[PDB]
């Protein structure tokens, strides 16, 4: 389904597969509003959301409602732009507010997207919507397609520089405007004290950047390591599970997007370490864990409610797939009672990745007068050292490097273990 | 591209997306042959795709062989072929990957004009609606619990049905539960024969992918996969993950129904992994087989794999060639006898198993386990001398270990230098 679908008389979920410049986020909502519908447009990015707002005011004199974590504008317009996260914060689908809900970038596999889309799919028909649109340029299974403005050239091993087992001739980046992607911060410019180039701000130049550079600077060529760092969960049974990082081949939305920084209307050249890519449409169980985490920490969802939402995400065709670990993660979080409220407040404030899990491990440490697994920033909420410095850490789960001695027999550790036996297969 | 590539005038590598329902490369080889060219076609197997019929090598300007055979023969013979077709080139078993990489590295020097990488399933393929197969989601309503959903007894009492489970144990358990409910349920998996009644009254076969015709297929939509973990305990672990099935799996399992008459496909999950990735453990398998079967130095295996990975439109893996080449280079003075035994016995990593065993015998120390992987060492108490010099984890460890052996330290150092 590649053109905006017509509003049915009764509820339907439709997939819209179309390019980024198709104005999925602008033209499509506008045409719906123009037909008299009230439409919600959901995006993962705060910057995106605020940016569609601004584009619609400047370009078309439409002042949308704009709802975002940090900021809220209410104009009474029939178009609302919101982040998935802010949408979850707002209770999800709240009453007959929207005829149409567009889940933009429905290929996103960050936690807000999965839980948000899950929530839309579970609640929309009941809340009175007629149409849900799952919109993306890059549905599951997508591979990057050749670009008319972008000639692509394989790096050979022949060139003065060390680049991921291959090499670049400086001839190719001297001079002009050049973007180079590396996977980590370290190598991102321990590409180095190398040699006009650095890893905010720059107006002839080479930019050596991670993915942190958000899409939409001038560039004549892009050079691409073709790998990226991703979060994964390991069931390491030491005693329970571990949240860690892995380096993996990039996927199609990665490659397309990195390549897309060049050839922006004027011809550009793309240079890669590797010709291939993972096709898009998979994500890790740790993203599920994060969804439960956020539901407990931010959205006051019992684990069982979160499950209902994620189950709807998973029962819906055409979305990224993942290991079915809903039962397991639901069980884990359901067991984590009586979290220290003040600790949770800080970890949220902190912007730790799993504020509920960080605060809870801190909570059992504090009650046991035991110290955190390490003294990484993550555990700042326990600056109460001497009374707790005593003895092993009761390890629930590994969220980072563990420096202290540990014990493994706390009832909650054993509880998580029994959950692993209960809910994980083979 | 959807149609056979013109034979170029200088050496080229081409891709061919055969149509989605297509069988093993038959039409396309016939065309090139008709134009006067000698064609080699390579598949994982030359058995009829149907599982019934003649071999593809039945008797000429068209030779049909396998990647396995091709590797065993030593690769591209002299100037024997103009055109080599690597068919089902989406296969990610060690033999297909090593074999294709070998073609890619050797074909031009061996006087071929054209290498064709053919598949009905390029990377990123998804399963498509089959016009003869109705697909119905399983709900949570039903007598028989099934991977978080339920199978109603009504859709399988009477008729013939196939149910895919991810593991032998699940197959045993499900069959038992069907039998107690009055259903004629038979379980199938590796190690069994044809207890599956091919007489042809009512039956519900519960099997893995080790597997007559069926009125319906019920799919758990998950599969068991071999993976490496760089676990640092002390080194790496070859283990199994249970993942969402991919498009070839979904297509192939669903395929068992609607083969003539209309069919029913029932599923636990609407989605699938996209096809086109394999694990670094396959790279490890490739070096293992290079050392164990094909008389390849690790560096010769590297050249073959590098050619594979430098080639677009093929499945992708982490680039761990330097790493794996590194660890096998360090694995010196393997005991010849043990390697024979692990090879005869069909272990997955004959070289690695026999090397860990070689290190035991020298240290005179026992195996990590006594699973039947470690057979070669039932010299079981000239030494029971405690601690096992653990190089890597190939399974579960039941003996106490020592992370002290120099080979252990060498691999660890390969890991820190070659990975990231
Ligand atoms: O900043 C925004 O606009 C989006 C947003 C993110 N969160 C928190 C969060 C973090 C990580 C995962 C999830 Cl599901 C939610 C929120 C929590 C409340 C309101 C909004 C948000
Ligand atoms: Ca592990
Ligand atoms: Ca790991």
Q: CA A377 to CA A400: how far, in whole Å?
A: 11
Provide CB contacts within 8 A for B402, sequence distance 6+.
B387, B388, B389, B390
Facing A279 at nearest CB: one of B124, B147, B167: B124
- Chain A positions touching B247 (Cβ under 8 A) are 141
Query: What residue's CA is closest to ligand 1, atom 2?
Result: A69
Cβ-Cβ contacts under 8 Å, B272 against chain A: 321
Closest Cα in chain B to A235: B241
- Domain B224-243+276-412 homologous superfamily, CATH: RNA Helicase Chain A , domain 3 (1.10.820.10)
Answer yes or no: are the C-beta atoms of B69 and B63 closer than 8 Å.
no
Q: Within 10 Å of residue A195's Cβ, how many Cβ atoms?
A: 11
Tally C-beta pairs within 8 A across A and B: 99
The ligand that comes nearest to the alpha carbon of residue A289 is: 1
B83 neighbors B113 (Cβ within 8 angstroms): yes
**Is B183 within 8 Å of B157 (Cβ atoms)?**
yes
Contacts of B67 (CB under 8 A, 6+ apart): B42, B43, B44, B86, B91, B95, B96, B98, B99, B100
Let me know: does B382 contact B410? Beta carbons within 8 Å: no
The answer to whether residue B269 neighbours chain A at the CB level (below 8 Å) is: yes
Among B208, B274, B282, the residue to mutate for chain A (most A Cβ within 10 A) = B274
A164 CB neighbours in chain B (<8 A) are: 319
Distance from residue B232's CA to the centre of ligand 2 (Å) = 9
Nearest CA in chain A to B126: A141
Looking at the complex, does the CB of residue A186 fall below 8 Å from at least one CB of chain B?
A: no
Centroid of ligand 3 to alpha carbon of A243 (angstroms): 9
Return the closest-CA partner of residue B40 out of B76, B16, B93, B91: B76
Alpha-carbon gap, residue B272 to A281, rounded angstroms: 9
Question: Is B218 within 8 Å of B146 (Cβ atoms)?
Answer: yes
Ligand 1 in contact with A69 (CB < 6 A)?
yes
Helix (H) or strand (E) holding A186: helix A185-188
Question: What is the distance between the alpha carbons of residues A11 and B1, in angstroms, rounded to a whole number?
Answer: 39
User: Tell me, which fold does domain A139-227+249-280 have in CATH?
Assistant: Rossmann fold (3.40.50)
- Return phi, psi of residue B411, to 5°: -65, -45
Rounded distance, CA B180 to CA B189, Å? 21
> How long a stretch of residues is chain B?
420
**Are A278 and B277 in contact (CB < 8 Å)?**
yes
Rounded-to-integer distance, Cα B88 and Cα B22, Å: 10
- Distance (angstroms) between ligand 2 centre and the Cα of A202 equals 42
Distance CA A151, CA A270 (A): 6
Q: What is the spatial distance between Cα B328 and Cα B339, in angstroms, rounded to a whole number? A: 14
Binding site membership of A348 for ligand 1 (Cβ less than 6 Å): no
Q: Are strands A65-67 and A79-83 parallel, antiparallel or unpaired?
A: parallel
| B239 alpha carbon, closest ligand | 2
Experimentally determined by: X-ray
Partner-chain residue, chosen from B123, B169, B310, that has the shortest CB–CB distance to A143: B123
Helices (H), strands (E): how many in chain A?
13, 17
Q: Quickly count: other Cβ atoms within 10 Å of residue B306's Cβ.
A: 18
B117, B139, B145, B277: best mutation site toward chain A, by most A Cβ within 10 Å?
B277
Q: C-alpha distances in angstroms, B320 versus A274, B123, B417?
A: 13, 20, 11
The ranges assigned to domains in chain B are 4-121, 122-222+244-275, 224-243+276-412
Token pair listed for A409:
């027999």
- Compare all CA atoms of chain A with the CA of B270 and give the residue at the minimum distance: A317
Structure resolution in Å? 2.3
Nearest CA in chain B to A236: B231
Q: Does A162 contact B at CB distance below 8 Å?
A: no
Closest-approaching ligand to the CA atom of A246: 3
- Number of other residues whose CB lies within 10 A of the CB of residue B192: 14
Would you call B318 and A275 a contact, using CB atoms and an 8 Å cutoff?
no
Please state, as a whole number, how many other Cβ atoms lie within 10 Å of the Cβ of residue A404. Answer: 16
Would you call A268 helix, strand, or coil by DSSP? Answer: strand
A275–B contact, CB cutoff 8 A: yes
For residue A334, the SS3 value is helix
Rounded Cα distance, A345 and A364, in Å: 16
Q: What separation in angstroms does the CA of A163 have from each of A20, A102, B273?
A: 31, 41, 30
Distance, CA of B302 to CA of A276 (rounded, Å): 18
Q: Within 13 Å, how many C-alpha atoms sit on residue A359's CB side?
A: 27
Q: A401 CB near a chain B CB, below 8 Å?
A: no
Q: Which of B100, B122, B124 should one mutate to test binding to chain A, selecting the residue with the greatest count of A CBs within 10 A?
A: B124
Task: Judge whether A422 is closer than 8 Å to chain B, CB to CB.
Answer: no
A156 within 8 A of A295, measured Cβ to Cβ: no
Residue A94, min C-alpha distance to chain B (Å): 28
Neighbours of ion ligand 3 (CB under 5 A): A 234; B 229
Beta strands in A214-352 (DSSP E): 221-224, 227-234, 242-249, 268-272
**Closest ligand to Cα A240:** 2
Strands B263-267 and B133-137: parallel
**Which residues 60-99 on chain A approach chain B with CB closer than 8 angstroms?**
none
Nearest ligand 1 atom to alpha carbon A90: 19
For chain B, say whether A405 makes contact (Cβ under 8 Å).
Answer: no
Give contacts of A106 with chain B, Cβ < 8 Å: none
- Interface contact flag, B273 A282, Cβ < 8 Å: yes
Full 3-state SS string of chain B: CCCCCCCCCCCEEEEEECCCCCCCCCHHHHHHHHCCCCEEEEECCCCCCCCCCCCCCCCCCEEEEEHHHHHHCCCCCCCCCCEEEECCCCCCCHHHHHHHHHHHHHCCCCCCCEEEEEECCCCCCCCCCCCCEEEEECCCCCCEEECCEEECHHHCCCCEEEEECCCHHHHHHHHHHHHCCCCCEEEECCCCCCCCCCCCCCEEEEECCCCCCECEEEECCEEEEEEEECCCCCCCEEEEEEEECEHHHHHHHHCCECCCCCEEEEECCCCCECCCECCHHHHHHHHHHHHHCCCCCHHHHHHHHHHHHCCCCCCECCCCHHHHHHHHHHCCCCCHHHHHHHHHCCCCCHHHHHHHHHHHHHHCCCCCCCCHHHHHHCCCCCCCCCCEECCCECCCCCCCEECCCHHHHHHHHHHHHHCC
Ligand 1 neighbour A83 (Cβ under 6 A): yes
Please judge whether B123 and A140 are an interchain contact, meaning their C-beta atoms are less than 8 angstroms apart: no
Angle between helices B298-309 and B94-106 (to 10 degrees): 80
Within 10 A of A182 (CB to CB), how many other CB atoms are there? 23
Nearest C-alpha in A relative to B247: A141
Measured from the CB, is residue A89 less than 6 Å from ligand 1?
yes
What CATH number was assigned to the domain covering residues A4-138? 3.40.50.300
Asked whether this chain's domains A139-227+249-280 and A229-248+281-417 adopt the same fold, the reply is: no
A234-272 exposure pattern, b = at least 16 Cβ within 10 A, e = fewer: beeeebbbbbbeebbbbbbbbbbbbbbbbbeeeebbbbb
CA distance B333 to B310: 32
Contacts of A146 in chain B (CB under 8 A): none
Instruction: Kindly report the nearest CA distance between residue B17 and chain A, in angstroms.
Output: 15
Q: β-pairing, A150-154 with A65-67?
A: unpaired
Burial class (CB in 10 A: 0-12, 13-18, 19+), B336: exposed
CATH superfamily of B122-222+244-275: P-loop containing nucleotide triphosphate hydrolases (3.40.50.300)
Q: Comparing C-alpha atoms, which of A75, A68, A124, A73 is closest to residue A96? A: A124
Closest ligand (CA of A118): 1
For residue A112 and ligand 1, the question of a CB distance below 6 A is answered with yes
Cross-chain residue pair B123–A280, CB shorter than 8 Å: no
Breaks in chain A (C–N > 2.5 Å) following residue: 195, 199, 203, 216
CB contact B242 to A (< 8 Å): yes
Q: Which CATH architecture has domain B4-121?
A: 3-Layer(aba) Sandwich (3.40)
Whether the Cβ atoms of residue A212 and residue A242 lie closer than 8 Å to each other? no
Give the architecture-level CATH label for domain A229-248+281-417. Orthogonal Bundle (1.10)
Put simply, the answer to whether A317 touches B124 (Cβ < 8 Å) is no
Q: What is the rounded distance in angstroms from the CA atom of residue B40 to the CA atom of residue B110?
A: 13
Query: Residues, chain A, total?
Result: 426
**Residue A224 annotated as part of some ligand binding site:** no
CA distances to A159, B136, B193 from B190, rounded to whole Å, are: 51, 29, 8
Residue of chain B with shortest Cα separation from A227: B318
């Amino acid at each position: 389904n590649s053109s905006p679908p017509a509003v049915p008389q009764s509820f339907q979920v439709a997939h819209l597969h179309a390019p980024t410049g198709s104005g999925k986020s602008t033209k499509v909502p506008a045409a719906y509003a123009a037909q008299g519908y009230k439409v919600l447009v959901l995006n993962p990015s705060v910057a995106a959301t605020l940016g569609f707002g601004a584009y619609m005011s400047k370009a078309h004199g439409v002042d949308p409602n704009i709802r975002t974590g940090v900021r809220t504008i209410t104009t009474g317009s029939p178009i609302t732009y919101s982040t998935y996260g802010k949408f979850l914060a707002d209770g999800g689908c709240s009453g007959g507010a929207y005829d149409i809900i567009i889940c933009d970038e429905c290929h996103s596999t960050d936690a807000t997207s999965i839980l948000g889309i899950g929530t839309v799919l579970d609640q929309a028909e009941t809340a009175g919507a007629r149409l849900v649109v799952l919109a993306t340029a890059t549905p599951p299974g997508s591979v990057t397609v050749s670009h008319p403005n972008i000639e692509e050239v394989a790096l050979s091993t022949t060139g003065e520089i060390p680049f991921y087992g291959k090499a670049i001739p400086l001839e190719v980046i001297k001079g002009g405007r050049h973007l180079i992607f590396c996977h980590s911060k370290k190598k991102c410019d321990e590409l180095a004290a190398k040699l006009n180039a650095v890893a905010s701000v720059i107006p002839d130049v080479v930019v050596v950047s991670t993915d942190a550079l958000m899409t939409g600077g001038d560039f004549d060529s892009v050079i691409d390591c073709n790998t990226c760092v991703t979060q994964t969960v390991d069931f390491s049974l030491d005693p329970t599970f571990t949240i860690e990082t892995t380096t993996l081949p990039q996927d199609a939305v990665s490659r397309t997007q990195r390549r897309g920084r060049t050839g922006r209307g004027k011809p550009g050249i793309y240079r890669f370490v590797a010709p291939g890519e993972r096709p898009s449409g998979m994500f890790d169980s740790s993203v599920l864990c994060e969804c439960y985490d956020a539901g407990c920490a931010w959205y006051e969802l019992m684990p069982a409610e979160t499950t209902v939402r994620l189950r709807a995400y998973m029962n819906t065709p055409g979305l990224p797939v993942c290991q079915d670990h809903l039962e397991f993660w639901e069980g884990v979080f359901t067991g984590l009672t009586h979290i220290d409220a003040h600790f949770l407040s800080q970890t949220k404030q902190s912007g730790e990745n799993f504020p509920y899990l960080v605060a809870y491990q801190a909570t059992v440490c504090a009650r046991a007068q035991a110290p955190p697994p390490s003294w990484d920033q993550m555990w700042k909420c326990l600056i109460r050292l001497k009374p707790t410095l005593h003895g092993p850490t009761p390890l629930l789960y590994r969220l980072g490097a563990v420096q202290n001695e540990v014990t493994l027999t706390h009832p909650i550790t054993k509880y998580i273990m029994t959950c692993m036996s209960a809910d994980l297969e083979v």
